[PDB]
Design a protein around this ligand. Structure first.
Ligand code: NA
Length: 129
């Protein structure tokens, strides 16, 4: 599924991502924009042979099992395919663990490079939340 900006903002809030670990909803929408372009089916191979899955490009290296990432962990206790669902619950649950891991949203390199310190409120501007 390709979400709209305000539709994704609404689904993130309903799943308790808004202000989770102090990160305003605009920060999560901005990360999703540049990770996946709001596409729940987005997958990208990393050079180390791990894969990033879903709206928030969660990495098989640590967080999900795709069965092809040697030496990896599955810390969110899920198949990486569940991160590709039109329902974002599993992606949200697992992003809660990632952002609690100690480096906050810096774990999303696109967040750091393209969202951090920007006017992230623009991402939820005009949205009926
Ligand atoms: Na893994």
């Amino acid at each position: 599924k390709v979400f709209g900006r305000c539709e994704l903002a609404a689904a993130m809030k309903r799943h308790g991502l808004d202000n989770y670990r102090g990160y305003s909803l605009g920060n999560w929408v901005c990360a999703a924009k540049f990770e996946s372009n709001f596409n729940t089916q987005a997958t990208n191979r990393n050079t180390d042979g791990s894969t990033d899955y879903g709206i928030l490009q969660i990495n098989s290296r640590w967080w999900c099992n795709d069965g092809r990432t040697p030496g990896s962990r599955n810390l969110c206790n899920i198949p990486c395919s569940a991160l590709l669902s039109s329902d974002i619950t599993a992606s949200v649950n697992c992003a809660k663990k990632i952002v609690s891991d100690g480096n906050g949203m810096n774990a999303w390199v696109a967040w750091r490079n393209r969202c951090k310190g920007t006017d992230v409120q623009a991402w939820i501007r005009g949205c009926r939340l």
